[PDB]
From a paper:
In mammals, [name] ([name]) is a major regulator of the expression of drug metabolism and xenobiotic detoxification genes. In mammals, [name] is a major transcription factor for regulating the expression of phase I–III drug metabolising/xenobiotic detoxifying genes. Nomilin is a naturally-occurring compound in citrus fruits such as lemons, grapefruits, oranges as well as in tangerine seed and peel. Here, we show that nomilin is a [name] agonist, and may extend lifespan and healthspan in C. elegans and mice via NHR-regulated detoxification functions, and induce the common transcriptome markers seen in the liver of mice in response to most lifespan-extending interventions.
To further confirm the direct binding between nomilin and hPXR, and discover more information on its structure and activation mechanism, we expressed the ligand-binding domian (LBD) domain of hPXR (residues 130–432) fused with residues 676–700 of [name] (NCOA1676–700) at the C-terminal as a co-activator peptide. The purified hPXRLBD-NCOA1676–700 (hPXR chimera hereafter) was co-crystallised with nomilin and the structure of the protein-drug complex was determined at a resolution of 2.1 Å, allowing a detailed observation of the drug-target interaction. The hPXR chimera forms a homodimer in the purification and crystal structure, as previously reported. The dimeric hPXR forms an interface via the β1' strand of the characteristic antiparallel β-sheet. A region of non-proteinaceous electron density was identified in the Fo-Fc map of the LBDs of each of the hPXR protomers, and the molecular framework of nomilin fit the electron density very well. The electron density in protomer A was refined with better continuity than that in protomer B. The binding of nomilin in the hPXR chimera was majorly mediated by the hydrogen bonds formed by two carbonyl oxygens with S247 and Q285, as well as the strong hydrophobic interaction among the backbone carbons of nomilin, and the cavity formed by a series of hydrophobic residues including M243, W299, I414 and M425. Two methionine residues, M243 and M425, closely contact both nomilin and rifampicin in their crystal structures, respectively. In addition, one of the structural differences between hPXR bound with nomilin and rifampicin is the helix formed by amino acids 193–209, which is well-refined in our structure and previously reported structures of hPXR in complex with SR12813, clotrimazole, and hyperforin, but absent in the structure of hPXR-rifampicin complex. However, S247A/R, M425A/Q and W299R completely blocked the activity of nomilin, indicating that these amino acid residues are critical for nomilin-dependent hPXR activation.
Residue numbers in the entry:
A (entry chain B): 142 to 177, 192 to 310, 316 to 432, 446 to 461
B (entry chain A): 142 to 177, 192 to 310, 316 to 432, 446 to 460
Write the structure that this text describes.
Amino acid sequence: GLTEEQRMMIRELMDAQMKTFDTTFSHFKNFRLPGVSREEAAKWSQVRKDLCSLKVSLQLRGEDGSVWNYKPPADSGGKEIFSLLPHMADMSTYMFKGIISFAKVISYFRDLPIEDQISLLKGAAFELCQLRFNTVFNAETGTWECGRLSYCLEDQQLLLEPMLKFHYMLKKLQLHEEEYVLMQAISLFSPDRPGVLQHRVVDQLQEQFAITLKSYIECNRPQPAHRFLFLKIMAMLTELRSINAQHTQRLLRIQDIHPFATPLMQELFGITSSLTERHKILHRLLQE
Amino acid sequence: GLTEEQRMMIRELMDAQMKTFDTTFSHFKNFRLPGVSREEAAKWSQVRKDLCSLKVSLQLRGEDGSVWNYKPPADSGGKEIFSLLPHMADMSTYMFKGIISFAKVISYFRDLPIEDQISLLKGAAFELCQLRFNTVFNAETGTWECGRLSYCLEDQQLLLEPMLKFHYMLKKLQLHEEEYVLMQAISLFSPDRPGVLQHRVVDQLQEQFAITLKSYIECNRPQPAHRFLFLKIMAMLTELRSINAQHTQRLLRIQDIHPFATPLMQELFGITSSLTERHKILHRLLQ
Ligand SMILES: CC(=O)O[C@H]1CC(=O)OC(C)(C)[C@@H]2CC(=O)[C@]3(C)[C@H](CC[C@@]4(C)[C@H](c5ccoc5)OC(=O)[C@H]5O[C@]543)[C@@]12C
Ligand SMILES: CC(=O)O[C@H]1CC(=O)OC(C)(C)[C@@H]2CC(=O)[C@]3(C)[C@H](CC[C@@]4(C)[C@H](c5ccoc5)OC(=O)[C@H]5O[C@]543)[C@@]12C
């Protein structure tokens, strides 16, 4: 059995997840929709590879049963490849606000100095976003099922995209809600994000989330399908950190030649004195 | 061959058609799109019948190669069934303006008194719209191809709807452009529309268009096998008159419980002193 502190810890994380993850996306509104020669050669070739890996069609089900479907242009060579970027920025921004609320509700996060709160969220927002997205990923259809919104991979050869491989591999672990939310906490409380000052405090917090996860698995996963599950999850978290870094770089290349990121995204990802001045939205959201 | 008069009359109609039928729908813009308790319940049950006979899906192909597609809901029970009415009011209004412009170009129509011009257009506008829609109808895919915009039947049992049976049958006749525009003229110059005063003058003009059509077919098509093509065309026109009456009743019932018609549609369909004063937009458009 788990200890009382471990049971209480899982209860609090799960309560926070339920309060701050709009899994039906009911309150995601007012978003944008696609309308109805030197080193620049190499910059465009890269950004074209970057966006082609991120290629999905979009579905919007009306309350009535009606369905709008958007298929992106099939090409790659001009401003047509950027047509979903405003929408993607709005969705991402909505998800990031839910993750910021997730952190704020957690006692262990609330008590950190506000500058470390900023640094941890800068370091983890994309990671916790993928973890939440994975819970609504349908691996059979290659579709993220977001309430009335659906994102469907265009189309083996897609497993070559580390982002997509992550989602398929994580889904195959068949994790419980408790295990997702402990992955979120472990990634959130990463002691070695840039700018974090209380390394030792955050590190001791992370270690207790990891011990709670390992213990949860031991009490609830007797089957041989789940041998080494704890260590697989920890490896997946290390992979998520690498995919995080590849995205930060990917986003900056796209932003350079085609601005699209929202102000909160620019703050989270470093797009241009002290930590609190340079992140006024994050600072405001944390004081609320 | 045709008489030189007949040849000139066909050329006038072809020129009017060329000037006023935006066959690619390039200038249909700014249209609306479906957003992202006694006798009254008996009115709703009839309007539900009226609307589900008028259900298509909507496709919009962007210039960049992207495609937006809209599927309408199942009837259920509520205002969801009205979701495409604003868009259709915009399509119809666009098509009606092109038909008013069509009529205006034609010497034989221009020479009629303004009140009969109004009456003939009120009587025939919907018919000429369907004749023009037929020319962009793809019978194999059940789709009206309107440039970058398509209306697709969803789906044998749809041949039960007179409107759809009309488009499939007319398409099967494989008419020439010249035969369609003569069909438009014969429908437009119908003497028996409500309010027409110069019945005999209009009847004689219609007969000259019918005679021109009959002779066109005699002279251009391989005599036998097209033996009764003219009469088949005339029977399609009769059927179009009845579809026009059914749709007017349909539109009026829908309008009553869910207003959607544009001002021009209100004038054309009688939706509320002299015929001019009750049709100020039509009057303006004709001068
Ligand atoms: C692979 C991809 O296309 O991802 C698409 C669809 C998809 O296949 O899977 C998931 C769910 C993983 C993926 C999650 C995700 O992270 C978002 C929401 C993303 C859309 C584009 C980006 C990457 C956006 C960006 C960055 C640069 O150009 C756009 O940057 C962001 O921070 C995030 O919005 C995302 C989404 C929906
Ligand atoms: C069967 C149907 O779904 O018809 C659809 C699609 C279709 O399959 O075929 C065509 C293309 C011929 C057909 C032509 C047509 O006439 C319009 C534009 C119509 C939509 C509804 C109506 C009838 C509208 C009305 C009246 C009452 O409620 C709306 O009134 C009007 O005057 C016209 O807009 C029309 C349209 C697009």
